[PDB]
Amino acid sequence: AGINRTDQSLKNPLLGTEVSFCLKSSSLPHHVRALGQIKARNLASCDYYLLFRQVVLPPEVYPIGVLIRAAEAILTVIVSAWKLEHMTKTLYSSVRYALTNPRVRAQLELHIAYQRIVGQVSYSREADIGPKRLGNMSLQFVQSLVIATIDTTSCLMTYNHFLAAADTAKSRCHLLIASVVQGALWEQGSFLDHIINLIDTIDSINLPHDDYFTIIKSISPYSQGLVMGRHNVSVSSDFASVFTIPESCPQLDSLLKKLLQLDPVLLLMVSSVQKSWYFPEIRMVDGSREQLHKMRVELETPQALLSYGHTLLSIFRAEFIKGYVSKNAKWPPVHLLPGCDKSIKNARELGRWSPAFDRRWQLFAKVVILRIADLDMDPDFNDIVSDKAIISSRRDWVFEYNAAAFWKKYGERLERPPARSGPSRLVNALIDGRLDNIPALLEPFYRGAVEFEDRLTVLVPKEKELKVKGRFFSKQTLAIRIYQVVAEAALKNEVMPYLKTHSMTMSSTALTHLLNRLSHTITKGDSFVINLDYSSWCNGFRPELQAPICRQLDQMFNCGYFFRTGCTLPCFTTFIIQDRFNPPYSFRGEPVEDGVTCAVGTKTMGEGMRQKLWTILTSCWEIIALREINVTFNILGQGDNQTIIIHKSASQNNQLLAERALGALYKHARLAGHNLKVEECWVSDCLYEYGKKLFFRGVPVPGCLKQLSRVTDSTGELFPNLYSKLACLTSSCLSAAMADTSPWVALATGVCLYLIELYVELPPAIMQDESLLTTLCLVGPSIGGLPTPATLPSVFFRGMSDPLPFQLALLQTLIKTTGVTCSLVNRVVKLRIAPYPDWLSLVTDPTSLNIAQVYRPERQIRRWIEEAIATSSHSSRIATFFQQPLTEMAQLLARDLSTMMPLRPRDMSALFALSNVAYGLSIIDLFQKSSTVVSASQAVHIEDVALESVRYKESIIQGLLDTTEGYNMQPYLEGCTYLAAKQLRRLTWGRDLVGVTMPFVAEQFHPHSSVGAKAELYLDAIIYCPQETLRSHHLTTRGDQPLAANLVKDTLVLHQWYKVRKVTDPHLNTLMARFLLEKGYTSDARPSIQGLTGYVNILSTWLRFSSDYLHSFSKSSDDYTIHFQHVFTYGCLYADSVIRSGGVISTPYLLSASCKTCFEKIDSEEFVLACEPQYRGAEWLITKPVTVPEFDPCVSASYCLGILIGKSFLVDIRASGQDIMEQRTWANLERFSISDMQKLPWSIVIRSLWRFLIGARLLQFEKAGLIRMLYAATGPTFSFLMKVFQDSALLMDCAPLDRLSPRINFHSRGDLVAKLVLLPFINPGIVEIEVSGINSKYHAVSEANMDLYIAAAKSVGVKPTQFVEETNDFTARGHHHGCYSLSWSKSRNQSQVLKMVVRKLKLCVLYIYPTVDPAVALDLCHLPALTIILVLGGDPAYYERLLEMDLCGAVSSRVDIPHSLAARTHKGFTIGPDTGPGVIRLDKLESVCYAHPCLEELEFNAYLDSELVDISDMCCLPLATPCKALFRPIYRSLQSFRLALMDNYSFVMDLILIRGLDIRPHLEEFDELLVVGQHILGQPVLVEVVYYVGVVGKRPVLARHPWSADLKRITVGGRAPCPSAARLRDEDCQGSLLVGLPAGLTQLLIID
Amino acid sequence: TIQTAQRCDHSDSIRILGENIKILDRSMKTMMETMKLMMEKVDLLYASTAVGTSAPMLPSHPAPPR
Amino acid sequence: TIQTAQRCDHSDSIRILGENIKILDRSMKTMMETMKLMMEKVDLLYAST
Amino acid sequence: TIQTAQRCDHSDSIRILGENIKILDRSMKTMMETMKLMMEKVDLLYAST
Amino acid sequence: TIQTAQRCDHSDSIRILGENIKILDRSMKTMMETMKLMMEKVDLLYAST
C-alpha cells in the first residue's frame, strides 16, 4: 500500500484524541489490532514520559572506541594544520572525557538505539512492524499508533510521542557533549555535575502532567527573576515571588539557588534550554474553548475604544508628518479642517517641524493626510510561493477530519465529495493559474464584500511548545493570504520608513548604535529597561481601535476601504480547529457552531495576521503613555514582547520614574483593550533581551547549550539521506559559530556528532577502520566528499573565503603526521574530472571545480521540474515566464562569458548576476528548495522516494567499500597549496583562473614569540603588543585600545567600476547594453552612482597591531594577495589559544611570513570579452519595467576630499564627547588606502579645505570648538590627518607650506598640522596670496562618485623620495659656526657631550636604550655614517614615537629595523645603562670653566668604561641645510618673527571676541612666542606678570598694568632668557622693530 | 487697441473663479471626512450585530474605476 | 482682428457662470448643514447601544 | 495673427464648462434628495428603539 | 498691445479648472453611491431590531 510513518523528527503537535477513540468503541481494522496488544495496566497517552524515563540499556553495548581514536586524530590534524599546537592536548581530552564518562556514553548509546529504530521503521511499506527491543522496553508499531511495554505496564500512544522521546534523547546527548566541551574551554570549570543533577531532579518530579509542565514552563522566568533580584542596583524586583517552584519542587529550588551562588551567567545558560525535556500533550477541549472565548470577549466598551482609536490616529498623523518633513523636506498633501490651529498653518507654509508639536498631538485631529502613493496589487514571486498552506474553498473543510469519527459522534455520514475541489498549496495555485489576475481577486476586498466561499480559517496548534492548553496559528483561504501579502508589503514599504520608532529598528546602523549606547549606560546607573509582555496580544485587538487608522491608510493610498475590510472581516468568518477524530457537525454542508470546535464569527483575525498595523498601534499607545509623563524614551519592539529604554532625569530617581512609567503604561494599555498583568511585566538595570539574545550587565550571555541542543527538521525537499543530515549538522555548527559561540566548541561538537551520525548509518566494516574514518572526515565537499565541519574556514572567519587551499593543507597535515598514505587519500577522494566544461557551475560557485559530485542526492533540478511545469501549466504566468528554456539560455550566456581572455570567475559571476536568466533560475530554485514546495515534489511519486532512499543507501555503502583508486593527487598534496590550488583549477577547468584563489593564512603567516626571535623573522612580520600581562580576566573585560529594478542601479555601479579602472571592450558594452534593454532602461548613458569576528573582539582591545611588513610588500604601490582581516583574526585566535590553555601573554608576539609563493603580485589587468555575445536579452522575465526617469581625476578627488574632510571636522565639532571617541565619519573615511594619498597632490587639498572653511563662515561657538579640538589631540579626523602627514615628503612637497613654515612656530608635528588646518580663521595674510587658486568646476564634483575617483587616484600619481637633513657633526679641528642643537626647550648639552664622545671614539654603530630622551636619539640618528640599532624587545612604540617627532626622515633611513626589533641586551657601545663595559655614562660636574674653542661652559662630564676621556680638544666642521630640529621657523632674521609678533597679537585679540572660548592655552602659546620676544626686548623680564586682559570699546586691551578696571588678571610664570638665541639675534640698528610696530606691541615691548 | 485689450482681459475674473472652485473643493473634502466618520459607526454597528449569525457581508465601497 | 477678439471672449457668460458658482456654494453650505444634523443623529444612535 | 487667434479661442471651453456646472448642479440636487431620504430612514432608529 | 493680449487669454488655465470641476463631479457620484451602500446596511439594521 502507501508509505507509512513518513517523519524522522517531531514536526507536529502531540494529540491524544486518536488514542481515546481507539480505547472507546473503534471499528477500524488497525485500532482492533492496537487494542488487542495492550496490557491490564495501560497508562494514558499524556503519561508517555513516565514510561520512557524507565528505559535502561546494558552498559557498553556499542563498540565506539574507534570513534574516540578517530575524533582525537581529526582534531589533532585540524589543530596542527592551524599551527596552534599548544591547544592540542586540551581538545582531544574533552572528547575522550565525554565519550568515556558513563552517563554521557549511556545517553549516546540510547540515542543510537533510538535512531536505529527510527531508521528501521520509517518510510516502510509494512503497516505492522513487530517486536523492536530497546533495552527493557519492547516496541510494537501499528501504523500511526505505537505500543510500548517494559514489564507489565503499557502505553498506547502515537508515533509523534515516540519521536518526542527520541528527540529528547538526542537533545540530551547534544547537551551533555556541549557541556563537556564548554567546560573544558572556559574559566569556570566543568559543570557536567549540575547538568546531571538537573536531569535527575526533573526526572524525579512525581506530579501530574499539568503541574509538571507548569514547572518546566516557569523554570526560565524564575531563574531570570533570581538573577534580577540579586543584581539590580537601582530598581526593585518582585518577579521571583510569582512562581510556585519553591513550594512544588524544593530540590530544583536548591539547585537553581546554588547555580545563582556560583555563577549567574551559568544559571542563565543552563536555564535557557526548554526542549531537552519532554513535550506536553495538548488538552484540545479546554484550550480550544479558551481560544474561542478569548477571540470574542470584550474588556472595554466599543464607545471608549473608538475614542482611543481617534487618539491613536492623532499621534499616527503627527509621527507620519514628522517623518515626511524630516525625509522629503516638505509637508505632505494635507487638508486642514475647520478649527485648525494657526501654528499648524504657519508650519505648513514654512515647511518646517516645530519642536513643540510632540507634546501637542491633539492638534492633529484637524489634519487629513491626502494621497501619497498607490497600492501595488501585484506581489512578486518570492512571497507568493512559500511558508503557508492554504484552502481552496469552504467545501474543503470535510477533508481535515475522519469519516468514522463523524459516524460515531453524530450518527450520520460525512457526505465527502470525491475530489478535493482545487489546490492545497500556493505553488499548485500558481500552476493551476488561480493567481493569474490579482486585482480581480482583490476587487471584493476593495468593494468591502468578500465572497462567501473565502471566509474560512482553520486554527492549527503549534508544535514543540510548553503550553498544555496550546497555541494556535491560522491556515487560511488563498484570497485572505494575498490580502495579507499586499497589505503587509504596503505598510512595510510606504508607511513604516516614515515612522521613526520602527525606522530605527529597521536600520542596522541605528539599531547597532542604540544597542551599544544601551550597553555602556546600564552599568553606570542610567537607562533602565522595562519589559512588557502581552499574553493576549493577537486575540486582544478589536475593530473599533483599528478603524480610524485603517481609514487614514485607505485615504493615503487611493484605495477604497481596502485596509478597513480586515477589521470587520472576522465578524463574518467561519472558524474551525484542526483536530482529527473530533469533527464539527454539518447541517447543510456547513459547520455548526458549538463553541469548542467551531465559531461562526469572532472579533479578531488571529495570530500573525495584520502584524504590521498592530505594531504601529502598540507603539502609538506607548508613545502617548510615555509622553504624558515627560520622559526620554526609546522603544524596541518585537511584536508581543516590548523592550523600553527610559533614561534618567536629573530631578527624580529611577524607582519613582519607573513606578510612574509602569502606571502610565498600564493605564494606556487598559484603554486600548490590552490589559497588562503585573505578574508578566518587570523592570531591570541588569537584564534585557533583544533578537533572541540575552544580555547580562551589557555582555551577551553564551548560547552554546541552547543552540547546539536544538533539533532541526532536516531532509529538506528530499528523501531521507546521509548527505542532508550532514549538511544540516554542518549548517547548524556554522550558524552557532556565527551567533557568538566559540569556534572550538562548535568544531569539536560537530566532529563528535558527525561520527555518531556515521555510526547510525554505516556498516561495521567501515566503522571499525580508524584511518578510513579520519580520511572520510577530512575530504569535504570542496573535492567531492561528504559535508564535514572540519573543512570550513567560515567558522573562524566572517568574510568570503576559499575552501580549497585549506582543504589541501589539511590533507598534507594528514599525510605527514597521521600514518595514512596518499593511496588511501586517492581511495577516498576518487577524483573524477568531467569530460566537458560546465560553466554554469562556475558562475554559480566561482571557487568550485569541474569534478563529479557522486554523493550528492539526485533531483534533476535543472530540466525535469521545468519540463513538468511547462507541461502541466494550465494557464498564464507560467507559459509567459517559461516560453523558452531557461537552462539553455543560461548555458549560452555562460559560454559567452567564458570567452573572457583573462578568465576571472568572480567578475564572470558578477556579470551573470545582472541578467534576467539569473532571476528566472532563482524563481525555479524557490520552486525546488523552499517551504511548501516539498509537498508537491514529494507527493509526485510519493511511493518511489521510499525505494530511492534504500537505493541511495546501498549505492553509498558500495561506493565507500570500493577499494579502487581515482586520479592521483600526489602533485597537488606537496609544496605550496596556493600554486597547488591554481594548478588543480587549471587541470580540471582547462584554462587558468585569475582572482579566486585566496591563500591559507596559517601557511602564509606563522606565529612566534619575541623571546627567541632572530633578525630575519622581523623582515616581514606583523607585531602585536599587549599593554598588560594578559590572563583569563581580560577575555571578558574590555580594555583601552579601540576596536526588482535595483538591478539597473547595480548594473550602472558595476559599469562605472569597470570604466573607471580603464577596461574598454565593445563586446562588454554591447552585453551591458543588452542588460539595460532587457531591464527597460533604453537611455544611452547615465553617469550616476579592525572589527574582526566577535569572538576575539574583547581580547582585541588589549592588543596593539600594526603593519610593519613594508620591507618587501608595502613599500610599493603594487597590491598583493593579503586579506588583512583574516590575518588579524588569526593573531587574536593565537592569543585566545594561549590564554585558554592556561598560559599568559607578558611579551609581545609576531606573525612572520613563511611561504614566499603565497605572496603573489596581483595583476590589475584589463579583461577583453573576445566573441560577440549571443545572449540577445529576454524582456519577458521582468514584469515591472522601470522607466527612463526612474578634467583629470586627481584635482576633482582633491577638491572632493578637501570638502569631505572639512565637513568631517564639522560633524566632529557637532559630535558630543561620547561620539568623538567613536571612529564614525560622515562619508566612511577610514577604509581608504594610504598609498594613493601619497600619489595625490595635497596643495590642492589644503587650498580646497581652506576655502571650504572660509566659505562656511561659522558662528563663534563652533569656531571655538574647532580651535579647542584641534589644539588638543582629539578627533578621529585629526588622527587621520596625522596618519596622512606621517611622512615628511608630503610636508615638504606642499608649495604653500614651505612658504608658510617661516611664519608659524610649532612645538610639535600635530601643532604644525593644527596651525595648517585652522590658520585661515586666525590669519588671512597668506589667504590673500593663495586665495586666487580657486576653480568652481572642481567644487561641483559630487561626493557620490568619490570612491570611483579614489579607484582612479591610485595609478596616476607617484610617491616622493624623502631627504636626509643634517645637524652638527663636530670632529677634528675647525671653526665654530654657532653650535645649534635643540635650543628650543631641551637639555642641549646632553646632546653636545654625547655627540663629542661618539665622534672621538669613532664608533660605527651605536645602541640606544629607550630610557634615553627621544631628542638626543634624533640628534644621534641625524649624524651621518652611523647605524643606530635600538633595543625594542618586540615593542615598536618607541621607534614610532621617535619617528613622529622628526621632520626629515633620517630616523627612517639610519636605523636598522629587524636588528632593532630583535635586540634585548647589551651587545656593543651603548648609551642608556648605568654602569658597564662599553657604556657611555653622564656624571654631573658642579664647577668647570670648560676651556674649549667651540663651546663656553659645561654642566655634565661624560664618563665611559669607569674612565674619563678628554673631549675638550675637538672642534667643528662646516654645516649644511638643517632639519626642523634646529627650528628655522624662528631663525636669526626678525622680520619673519615680527610678522609672527604681528600675527599672535592679532590671534589673541580675535579669539577674545570668540564666544565660548576662554583664552588660557592660546594665551600660553602667545606667552611662549613673547618669551622669544623677551629674549631680545632688552627691558627687565618679570618672571611673574600680573598681565591684565580685557576688551574696552570692542578693542582688546591687554598688558601688565591694568589700563581699566574691567580687565581680567591672568597669572603667567616661568619667563626667563634660557635659550642661547637671545645673544645671537641681538642685532644692529635698534628701533627697527619699532618701525612698523603696533602701539600695543610697543606697550608689550617697553615693560611698564 | 487698448480698449479692445481691456475688454478682452479677464485675469481677475479667472482668478476669482479658480479660487471659488478651490472653496468648492475644500468644502467637498470636509463633507467626505464627515461621511467617512458616519461610515465607521454604521459599519461597526452592523459588524457587532453580525457576530454569531449568518448575516452576509454587504458592500461598503461601490467599484474600482475602469 | 477686432471681430476675432470679440468672438474669442464671452464676458457675460463668465459673469453668469460665476453667479452659478455662487449658487453652487450655497447648495454646498446647506448640504454641510444637513450632514451636521445627520452626524448628530448617528452619534446619538451609536451612544445608546 | 491667425495662430494667436486660434490660441485665443475660448468659445468651446466656456460652453462645455457651462455643461459641466449644469451636470454638477443636477448631481448635487439628486444627492440632496438622497440626503433627505436618508434622514427619513435614520429617524426610525429611536422609533424602533 | 501684444503682451496685453497675452494677459487676456489662458486656455490652459480654463482647461485645468474644467478638469478641476469634473473631478468634483466624480466625487459627488462616489459619495452618492457610497451613501446608498450605507442605506442598505441601515435598512438591514432596521429589519434586525
Ligand SMILES: [Zn+2]
Ligand atoms: Zn604556501
Ligand SMILES: [Zn+2]
Ligand atoms: Zn629630521
